[PDB]
Amino acid sequence: GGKYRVYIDQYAKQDYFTVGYKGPNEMDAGIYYAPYVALTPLRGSDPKNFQP
Amino acid sequence: GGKYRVYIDQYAKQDYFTVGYKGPNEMDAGIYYAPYVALTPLRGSDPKNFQP
């Protein structure tokens, strides 16, 4: 209707919908996801055999 | 004689010679040496004592 952003949960198990609110702010969000560290790569090798 | 390419087997086991044929077209080889990976260096150190 030009009002609700509709998203498809491609892994839904049965059949349902959830209506929710999100404001212009981040504090006004219901649930928070607050990344501190993300996808930090770690690298080395096992020196015994040098495989990465 | 201007005809045979003579090489010295610096590690010959007894005392002999081998006469062989090698054509201008490498397919006319008898035996083929076909390198794929040439001396890839590996590096590392063991973190328990840090020796390289």
Side-chain angles (χ1 to χ4, degrees), chain A residues 4-47:
Chain A
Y4 309 98
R5 294 180 67 85
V6 177
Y7 297 90
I8 299 167
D9 183 342
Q10 72 268 38
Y11 301 118
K13 300 301 189 298
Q14 291 174 275
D15 193 352
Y16 76 101
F17 66 97
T18 300
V19 179
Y21 172 74
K22 173 64 169 68
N25 202 309
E26 295 294 315
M27 294 309 297
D28 191 18
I31 185 167
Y32 303 133
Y33 160 69
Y36 158 53
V37 177
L39 299 176
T40 299
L42 296 90
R43 291 182 178 272
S45 67
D46 183 336

Side-chain angles (χ1 to χ4, degrees), chain B residues 2-36:
Chain B
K3 291 182 172 178
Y4 302 85
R5 294 183 67 83
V6 178
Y7 297 85
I8 300 165
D9 184 358
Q10 75 195 315
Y11 292 113
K13 264 50 184 173
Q14 293 181 29
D15 191 353
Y16 62 91
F17 65 96
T18 300
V19 180
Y21 174 72
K22 170 63 177 53
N25 185 318
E26 290 189 10
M27 291 303 294
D28 191 15
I31 295 170
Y32 299 89
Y33 172 63
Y36 178 57

Side-chain angles (χ1 to χ4, degrees), chain A residues 45 47 50, chain B residues 42-43 45:
Chain A
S45 67
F50 304 102
Chain B
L42 294 311
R43 301 285 181 174
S45 66

